[model samples]
Target chain A: SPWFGMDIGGTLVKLSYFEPIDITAEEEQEEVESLKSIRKYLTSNVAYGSTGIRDVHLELKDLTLFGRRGNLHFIRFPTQDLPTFIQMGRDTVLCATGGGAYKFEKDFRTIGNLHLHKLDELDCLVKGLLYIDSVSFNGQAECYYFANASEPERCQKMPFNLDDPYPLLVVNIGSGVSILAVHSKDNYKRVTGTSLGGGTFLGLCSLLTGCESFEEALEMASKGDSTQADKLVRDIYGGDYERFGLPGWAVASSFGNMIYKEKRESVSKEDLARATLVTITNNIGSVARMCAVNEKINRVVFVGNFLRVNTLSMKLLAYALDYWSKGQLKALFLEHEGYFGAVGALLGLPNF
Target chain B: SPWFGMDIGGTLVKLSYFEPIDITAEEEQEEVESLKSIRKYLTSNVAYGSTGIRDVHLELKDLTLFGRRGNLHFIRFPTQDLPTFIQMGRDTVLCATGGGAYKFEKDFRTIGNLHLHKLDELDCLVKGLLYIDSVSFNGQAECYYFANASEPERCQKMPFNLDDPYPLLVVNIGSGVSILAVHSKDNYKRVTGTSLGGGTFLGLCSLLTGCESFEEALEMASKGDSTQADKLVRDIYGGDYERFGLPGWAVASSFGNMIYKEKRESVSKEDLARATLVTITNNIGSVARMCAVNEKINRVVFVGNFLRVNTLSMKLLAYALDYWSKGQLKALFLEHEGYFGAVGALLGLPNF
Candidate 1:
């Protein structure tokens, strides 16, 4: 029997099985596809598991153990409906992460009859980074696997440097937002943060755009134009940049479009999306500058599922950090944005 | 001949020679005191010759100036050193108004030109008060004053009567200290006042204290000890107040005599004076409670020369105000404390 790991996210729910890696290549891909397919799966698929599972006896070891190549499962759900699905799982040593874990812990215990384990979300991200280092060489996981694709100089001749860097800022844009200053190889501090974060994005999307789920919001954000929504000053002789002492094309002000009634009617959804993305990045960049000034450190690393392959948000955040700090501060991103908290919880348990 | 009026003050020299007053029985005091004893002669005698004068001119008029009931001879100083000596001549303005007109204004301009005109110090005091009433008395002041003294019984017989019955507080201890509160009145804005004024006592004594001038030493308060000679909780209760609610004899834990050294022999004079005054005031009665709750006048009126009567320091102002405010707010003070500005200048000015 293998250990089961589950990550309860602000927007998604994840479940993982730590099975021996003796399966055929085709079988592994099929299983990977099944998890990906879960995004498209309806509530009916979740009900199937609820009805099939029988013995609720969740052994402490069975729930907490993760193989050397730890299995991770990620899932998304509307937070309000969490208890109904959490009750169906039999894992007693179940670990939970994110702000919701604490907020919803009692409800989960009362309704699901399962013990809740907590992980320091920041600690989990660090642990997950370490865990990812061990599997970069494995060819089976392209997204998770590190490749020295120094291509023209073929793979056989080049070596991938797997050593992780320190002194990076890890901005976790989860349901709630936080920026962690990782100063050493193993130590990090949550230096500064804001109330507006990934959770704000998803929650706002659900309420404002009528988006049904976190994925839907992300999809909307992906295609939404942001420039049209952001207000800029009317063209001056030199431009608004001169007012703030910036170059001509530089953004002097944002969200100022509210002043122009005529422009509001012609704005596109893409502009709103771009503006929101830029706004979050701008705030993070400003926070990073503060952290740099305070801690005297420079690199900023952004994580959390909100950045799940969002290129525009990443570029804007990076550009803002660079622009504000005059190249003194750098913004970086992580591939594994979400599951670190659950992994950190599993790592935190006392060894018998 | 040019008419001249001179005002000599403890700290300044004011030379104002207005065309003399329209005289009447205002000259009666001068005539009667002329035949009396040396003291009376000194008080009532007025020089009536234009001999041996230079650098300026003197003019005599049958009219009374300064609303004083006497004939006026406005005399300007030829050289400025005449005010320091009481017997130099007969008549001169007794007090010069503000700190500037008294302190170094003459020296800043010339020397030996001290036949200074010292206006009634209270004159400026009155002027400053009237100025404030005419201007800033609209919003914050009115609200604050009324809030502390909004009751008729508390106000009783006040100088001014307004339609509203409101409690109000006033604290104006500058060169001297005074705290007053009016509970209520008809329409004249009921005002109750106190005599802790700084002018006569503290201001005069500060010169004799052998300390730097009031303003200079006040700047030194960040390092000075107003409680160095005070008594502590142990002195009063033989223990700390935190062990239990302070007994009536606890002397309030906020202030303690522990600030003093054990030997207590070599303590400085100013420190001793300051400490004793501060401790007694701190232990016995606070401005806030005494004026607000105890007197049932929420509004406290503080006015006196203690705050402005230089060299005599009105100690621990912000603290006293804070103590009175009880962290709710600050006890108000007028921009001008001595009524000299009002009484001499504004009140003297003719209004059509």
Candidate 2:
């Protein structure tokens, strides 16, 4: 029997399954195109590549009669449209994790013999992280430091110590921010969390700027200037407070300038979008750093759909972690951040 | 020689001095009116009542011949008008604290041998806090809890433990935020700080809403709804994520809704002001709470000119402390918040 994994989150549901590799290059190209079409439906940036696990080929073949070899495939559906997802994979038995799994369990079962083997969310996250760290292409986590937001090479990737990854803080920013202190393998606790996350960004953007989509809001942010909406140190002091180590360009208050009577009507929508993004990203980064400091943790791994294709948030997080932690704590990001839970669910299965 | 204490900060210069009381009640009423005029030039909400201290009568007499008996008088000057303040108190020695003391020492001396007895900012802060806790009207510190923002009696004040004030965290939100952990009366450390503070609020409000003054901006906030601009938990998950202990009404992101295409022109200036207030207040409170938790301190005393007139900020801080600390930490406010540094400077003198 074929096995698949599902991660049902507050906003979206992710799926990971093995599919037989086509022998012919032409057929493989067609399959690739088919996967590309599936990618269009997903919210995160999908990477189509081999999993580099040739050892699992025989097991993969034994699980299904469709092919002798296989490759891992990933897809996602909005959690609100769970019915559509269940209908697509009506008879498949899925190993699932996350709060939505339990919430939508009965609904999933309504679509036939679609059995969901429930798995612990945190357990699956760690397993998925370890698995990806060992096997996937460019699997090692990398750290991005924003020297200058405008610079292309501002992101600096460093190899993390997988052998001694204990005493680490994992900030999984999904619909809400969850800060976990990972002490060791299978040993972790949710030390702190905040309601602020991706859902907030998208939802607020929808409400404030009337942006129909998250991508549209992000694009608007990229073109907008936050200084118009945010109060900078220079704006407050008429110069930099160098004595206090505060630069003139630093954001003193988010959306603060919007109170100026003239600015209320003059400030553009794009500027508001930028300010909103900065406020949330900076707050999350600051909190994450504080949590790391509290536990004496030096490394922080940021995972979740919030970071997916969101350069502004990533850059802000990188800059904030550096600025607040004074270069003491490092922020690491996984290439396959969004799929961690799903992959973890797949790996947690006994038969897998 | 007339002795006065001054705390020159980044934005406002605070002054505190003793004045002799007139013998007749009519004369005292006239003096109060005279002091009210002086307050017109100051920034903080000046207290017009009596000083409540009687022991300093002799010292007050020796300091000046303005009156036979006196009460402590307080006033402020915009930091930008340092020249004007120096002219007003020329030829008199003033005890001063804060960075401005050194920054404008020469300017003060230029005014007819006007000497500024410079005192350490942090030392003066603690000194002032202890002094006010002992002698001033309602000297003991009080805690304010904000149960609701819109209610008239939103702030509930309760007495704090001043005797066991050690292991306390003092958050001074002035032009910038300074987080100091006071282990004892004299032994304290500037553990952390942020550039976001009152100056930020005023500066940003000036630029965004074209508000002529801080008071106007605050008034706008009082009339505004932050939910119009902020992203709430309910907006993100379509309801509350109660299992994770996140309420639908919780602020998911500050000014996040400003990105909505349709909201750009629809959101009012008051709402923008309110959002700005919430963002800064929440950030400061979160940081303060984190510091308190780190030091295992339960009492967090918030002092600074920022809280003097901004009920919105004060209430927000109170609410944030409650939310973040889970009621473990208490936020205390001083009746004479803006005068702390000035009062401390006065107390630090060899002769009182």
Candidate 3:
């Protein structure tokens, strides 16, 4: 029997499981094709405008008892569709973490006969981070720069030493934003958190633009001009107030221009969508940077479902952190950002 | 001859001039009537919901040669009507400060024969702050609480010791936000700034609600509900995520709820206006708090034309600073906030 781990969060439920690698060439080819399609889906619909996928390697030796040669798979389902997730995982005993675990404890037990072994949310988060830091093949973290959106290869991978990656800040932007000052493996404190998170983005974007889904909102934002809705420095100064180090393009106020009488009707839904996205992303980034600065932490790792497939938000966050910190602080994103809690749950399972 | 000082900014031109106090009872009554009318106009259209007038007293000893017992009048005119301002002060040498002082230097000379005496913007800001701290009848600074707008008297007057007030952050919210770390009377540094300021508030509000004037927009915001546009914590988690210390009513994201498909048309223009106001004010306050925390400054003085007539913004700002700083920081507002630069210019005049 195989075991699985799940992280039921406010918005999404992430799952992690291992599969045996003892397969034929045809099966390997099929698996490779499946991976390629997944990558295409992630890049095209989810990670649009992002640099690339970050690679996380599972230590095969450590998992040899479960499978001599196998791959660990991570995926997610919207919490609203948890019934489908439960149907798929019926009768399976799984380790779980996050707020959703408690909320749906009864559902998992009665609806699917699924026995859920609950783990602490933060505990699972740190465990997942540690595991990734230990076994990631590419790098522990990658910083994406979207200064030139035309170039996706501008991402820089920074190696994380597992022995001492402490005293850092992990900003988990889930349904809400949480800033945690991670001191050691198990010693971490929640410095501060904001209610503003992915739900806000999705929820606000939906109301403003009548966009039915996050994907549509992201697409609309990518096409829309935020300056149309926001009051940029240039608009106020009649040009760049370069003396004050303010560029003409800098957003003086998000959705600031929306107050103009004549300009009100001129702005499109897409513009409003983009402006909303920029406002939320910038707020989160600024708050995160402030937390990092206040806590005297140099490294900030942004995780959660918000950054899962949203590159525009990531770009804004990266830009904001860089701008506010003056390059003194680094914003890092994990390849398996959304699955941290789930992976942590799996790593924390007894006798793994 | 009576001397005059002016602060020409991006949006409004503030004037400070003194009139001889010596006059007959009939003349005094007329002057009082004029002041009453001005106050009415200001309250009805310009000042809107402000509490009262701020008096700037030039020491009779300092200005004995010019006048004995005079009232210093502070007023403003829209910058777009510079021709009117120049026409009114034709051939007069007015001490001036701000970016407009430089931008319109040639205009003042060519159009009005106005001999403009230029003063450095920040220099004028500090000078005015010092002067206000010196002879303010109420208190050096007043901290207004607007958590409950229904009660305006909730404002508190805080004593500001001018003699040793240093290492404080002066957040001048003009057309753009300038966060200055004032070390002493004249020693200060532009620590950080954001383009989002008063101009943004007015500009964005105008576009969002088509409220031709800041006064009207403010009134609309006062009556509007921001939760209709913003994503609050309660809106996201179905209740408050209180375990994380986030209150149910806390704004998760400004204009965040606007993304809902059905909620688009449901939100009124007033709601958008209020949402925009909250977003900008909160952003500025949060940034200011961050600067204060980073510089270890306990006092933050907010001055600008934006706060001149907009009490709603001030309330939001005061609340934000208190909330974000966890009561560690103090937000102080000058009585003559909008006229600081002009007052500074008046104080800096040579051979006064």
Residue-level lDDT of model 2, residues A1-352, one tens digit each, is 3546778876667777765443477765655553545444332334322211112211222123223455565566666567755565453467888776666767767866556787766678777776666554333343333444344576644455555667778888877677888888877877777656776677655654667767888998898888887767666555565555767787765665654557666777788778768867877887888889898998888988888778778877876787667788777776667777887898766653
Q: Candidate 3 docking: what grade?
A: acceptable
Cα shift from native, residue A162, model 1 (Å): 7.1
Per-residue lDDT tens digits of candidate 3, residues A101-194? Answer: 7667777787444467877777888888777666653433323334432234774434444456778789898876777899888689887666
Native contact fraction per model? 0.00, 0.22, 0.34
Candidate 2's TM-score: 0.73
Residue B37, model 1: lDDT of 44
All candidates: TM-score:
0.42, 0.73, 0.76
Query: Ranking by TM-score, best first?
Result: 3, 2, 1
lDDT of 1 by residue, A1-352 (tens): 1233445554445443343334468855666554434333421243333322211111111122333333233333444356666564323456655445555667667744455676545666676655544454233221221122222233221232335556666677754455677766577776644434554344333322445544565577777765454422222112322322334343323333322335455655445545545655555455556556566677566766667656656666655666656667766554555555655655554431
| lDDT by residue (tens digit), candidate 2, B164-242 | 6678799998877888999988789887776567765775556546677778888998998888877676665555656
What does the i-RMS of model 3 come to? 3.9
Q: Could you tell me how far off, in angstroms, the CA of residue A163 lies in candidate 1 after the best superposition?
A: 2.4
Interface RMSD of candidate number 1? 26.4
